[PDB]
Design an enzyme around this catalytic site. Structure first.
Site, PDB file in Angstrom:
ATOM      1  N   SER A  92       3.650 -11.062  -2.741  1.00 40.08           N
ATOM      2  CA  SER A  92       4.146 -12.726  -2.605  1.00 40.08           C
ATOM      3  C   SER A  92       3.948 -13.527  -3.728  1.00 40.08           C
ATOM      4  CB  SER A  92       3.903 -13.274  -1.278  1.00 40.08           C
ATOM      5  OG  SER A  92       4.379 -12.615  -0.330  1.00 40.08           O
ATOM      6  N   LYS A 135       6.049 -16.139  -5.900  1.00 45.38           N
ATOM      7  CA  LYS A 135       6.765 -17.173  -5.417  1.00 45.38           C
ATOM      8  C   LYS A 135       6.272 -18.533  -5.897  1.00 45.38           C
ATOM      9  CE  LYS A 135       7.758 -14.577  -1.550  1.00 45.38           C
ATOM     10  NZ  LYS A 135       7.113 -13.894  -0.118  1.00 45.38           N
ATOM     11  N   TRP A 182       9.493 -11.874   7.664  1.00 43.87           N
ATOM     12  CA  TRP A 182       8.614 -12.608   6.940  1.00 43.87           C
ATOM     13  C   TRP A 182       9.385 -13.781   6.005  1.00 43.87           C
ATOM     14  CZ3 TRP A 182       7.454  -7.421   6.645  1.00 43.87           C
ATOM     15  CH2 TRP A 182       6.436  -6.776   7.330  1.00 43.87           C
ATOM     16  N   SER A 208       5.445 -18.450   2.255  1.00 43.96           N
ATOM     17  CA  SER A 208       5.664 -17.257   1.623  1.00 43.96           C
ATOM     18  C   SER A 208       7.039 -16.810   1.965  1.00 43.96           C
ATOM     19  CB  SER A 208       4.497 -16.118   1.964  1.00 43.96           C
ATOM     20  OG  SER A 208       4.586 -15.257   0.961  1.00 43.96           O
ATOM     21  N   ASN A 255      10.234 -14.891   2.584  1.00 46.16           N
ATOM     22  CA  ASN A 255      11.014 -13.893   1.655  1.00 46.16           C
ATOM     23  C   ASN A 255      12.281 -13.971   1.393  1.00 46.16           C
ATOM     24  OD1 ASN A 255       8.847 -12.041   1.059  1.00 46.16           O
ATOM     25  ND2 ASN A 255       9.103 -10.964   2.956  1.00 46.16           N
ATOM     26  N   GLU A 282      11.149  -4.912  -1.704  1.00 45.39           N
ATOM     27  CA  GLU A 282      10.872  -3.816  -2.301  1.00 45.39           C
ATOM     28  C   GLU A 282       9.828  -3.825  -3.272  1.00 45.39           C
ATOM     29  OE1 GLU A 282      14.185  -4.864  -2.053  1.00 45.39           O
ATOM     30  OE2 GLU A 282      15.304  -3.119  -1.251  1.00 45.39           O
ATOM     31  N   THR A 311      -0.851 -17.006  -2.127  1.00 42.28           N
ATOM     32  CA  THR A 311      -1.347 -15.801  -1.701  1.00 42.28           C
ATOM     33  C   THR A 311      -0.244 -14.708  -1.967  1.00 42.28           C
ATOM     34  OG1 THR A 311      -0.936 -16.264   0.479  1.00 42.28           O
ATOM     35  CG2 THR A 311      -2.908 -16.791  -0.083  1.00 42.28           C
ATOM     36  N   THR A 316       0.343 -10.425  -0.155  1.00 42.57           N
ATOM     37  CA  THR A 316      -0.350  -9.306   0.670  1.00 42.57           C
ATOM     38  C   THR A 316       0.552  -8.198   0.721  1.00 42.57           C
ATOM     39  OG1 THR A 316      -1.618 -10.928   2.027  1.00 42.57           O
ATOM     40  CG2 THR A 316      -1.605  -8.726   2.800  1.00 42.57           C
TER      41      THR A 316
HETATM   42  C1  C9D Z   1       3.768 -11.263   0.340  1.00 43.41           C
HETATM   43  O1  C9D Z   1       3.124 -10.878  -0.133  1.00 43.41           O
HETATM   44  N1  C9D Z   1       4.407 -11.220   1.720  1.00 43.41           N
HETATM   45  C2  C9D Z   1       5.258 -12.370   2.306  1.00 43.41           C
HETATM   46  C3  C9D Z   1       4.153 -12.730   3.592  1.00 43.41           C
HETATM   47  N2  C9D Z   1       3.263 -13.792   3.595  1.00 43.41           N
HETATM   48  O2  C9D Z   1       2.017 -13.066   3.016  1.00 43.41           O
HETATM   49  S1  C9D Z   1       1.240 -13.905   2.046  1.00 43.41           S
HETATM   50  O3  C9D Z   1       1.023 -15.352   2.539  1.00 43.41           O
HETATM   51  O4  C9D Z   1       2.253 -14.023   0.906  1.00 43.41           O
HETATM   52  O5  C9D Z   1      -0.093 -13.301   1.681  1.00 43.41           O
HETATM   53  C4  C9D Z   1       3.870 -11.228   4.412  1.00 43.41           C
HETATM   54  C5  C9D Z   1       3.295 -10.371   3.554  1.00 43.41           C
HETATM   55  C6  C9D Z   1       4.082 -10.174   2.387  1.00 43.41           C
HETATM   56  C7  C9D Z   1       5.288  -9.074   2.730  1.00 43.41           C
HETATM   57  O6  C9D Z   1       6.392  -9.351   2.376  1.00 43.41           O
HETATM   58  N3  C9D Z   1       5.002  -8.267   3.663  1.00 43.41           N
HETATM   59  N4  C9D Z   1       6.176  -7.425   3.765  1.00 43.41           N
HETATM   60  C8  C9D Z   1       6.144  -6.248   3.044  1.00 43.41           C
HETATM   61  O7  C9D Z   1       5.409  -5.971   1.807  1.00 43.41           O
HETATM   62  C9  C9D Z   1       7.106  -5.178   3.577  1.00 43.41           C
HETATM   63  C10 C9D Z   1       6.512  -4.285   4.683  1.00 43.41           C
HETATM   64  C11 C9D Z   1       5.986  -3.117   3.671  1.00 43.41           C
HETATM   65  N5  C9D Z   1       6.768  -3.067   2.468  1.00 43.41           N
HETATM   66  C12 C9D Z   1       7.737  -4.097   2.593  1.00 43.41           C
END
Ligand code: C9D
Length: 268
Positions: free
Chosen positions: A48, A51, A83, A108, A110, A146, A213, A215
């Site tokens: 993420s 972004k 998300w 974050s 998506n 992806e 962040t 993850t």
């Molecule tokens: C970013 O890394 N993501 C968006 C959400 N917020 O987390 S964070 O604040 O940025 O750390 C959730 C984590 C992540 C994300 O999109 N997670 N989703 C996945 O990666 C999908 C499930 C497994 N592959 C795609």
């Protein structure tokens, strides 16, 4: 004489060995020019964390396109991916580009990120913006979701801690953007809601922090980057990225916070 980088680096090596993966760190003290560096030029998945730079790219476009931030994006139901907690609330009205940008940075979101990527000409358009500010390392290749695959050895959707830090400095503290856009980027970062257990956890509560962040949820892969404004002295810019070799290796927010603390305490 120059710094003994072995002695600066050692505690990161111990940390990453307990973690079971690799930790990459770059920190720059904009007061003295001091830095801390560990695996700083290795590639790690962005997850993420792209972004933040996406929002900066939007701000740059708004300098050429008056009112871009005010423009409504009215999307259909197939924009929604998991998300996306903010864009899921506004399906019946749309959101402005400013609202989408804030949501992408601070929640974050998506779908918001995909909608803004489309406005900027896709992953390649964001990569082109990064090339324009002299970042030759950053690459975004794919879209949400992806881009989170984080497969070891895949160069897609990666950058380095050093490039992230240098680009973040140019955009937040340097004059890469006009002042109003720069302060907007800073304000969006300062309002992030997802980073309380990462770089922020290593910084005194008195000091302002802006961060983004990431993850990926696989391969021990997670990250944070930030600007930290200690009271009455020059700000610090830093990035902490992790990865690990097995798909089921856990990420760790505590390890990111610990590495941030080692970096911040090691400057100057
Ligand atoms: C970013 O890394 N993501 C968006 C959400 N917020 O987390 S964070 O604040 O940025 O750390 C959730 C984590 C992540 C994300 O999109 N997670 N989703 C996945 O990666 C999908 C499930 C497994 N592959 C795609």
């Amino acid at each position: 004489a120059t710094a003994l980088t072995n002695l600066v680096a050692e505690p990161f090596a111990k940390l990453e060995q307990d973690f079971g993966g690799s930790i990459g760190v770059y920190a720059m003290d904009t007061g003295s020019g001091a830095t801390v560096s560990y695996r700083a030029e290795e590639r790690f998945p962005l997850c993420s964390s792209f972004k933040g730079f996406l929002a900066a790219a939007v701000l740059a476009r708004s300098q050429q396109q008056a009112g871009l931030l005010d423009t409504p994006i009215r999307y259909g139901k197939n924009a929604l991916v998991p998300w996306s907690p903010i864009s899921e609330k506004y399906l019946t009205t749309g959101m402005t580009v400013a609202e989408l940008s804030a949501a992408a940075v601070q929640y974050s979101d998506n779908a918001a990120a995909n909608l803004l990527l489309k406005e900027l000409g896709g992953p390649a358009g964001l990569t082109a913006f990064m090339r324009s500010i002299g970042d030759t390392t950053f690459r975004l290749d794919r879209w949400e979701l992806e881009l989170n695959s984080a497969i070891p050895g895949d160069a897609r959707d990666t950058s380095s801690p050093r490039a992230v830090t240098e680009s973040l400095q140019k955009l937040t503290l340097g004059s890469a953007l006009a002042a109003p856009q720069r302060q907007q980027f800073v304000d969006w970062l300062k309002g992030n809601t997802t980073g309380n257990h990462r770089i922020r956890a290593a910084v005194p509560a008195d000091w302002a922090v802006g961060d983004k962040t990431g993850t990926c949820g696989v391969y021990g892969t997670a990250n944070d980057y930030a600007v930290v404004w200690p009271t009455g002295r020059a700000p610090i810019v830093l990035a902490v990225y992790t990865r690990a070799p097995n798909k089921d290796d856990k990420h760790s927010e505590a390890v990111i916070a610990a590495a941030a603390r080692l970096a911040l305490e090691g400057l100057g």
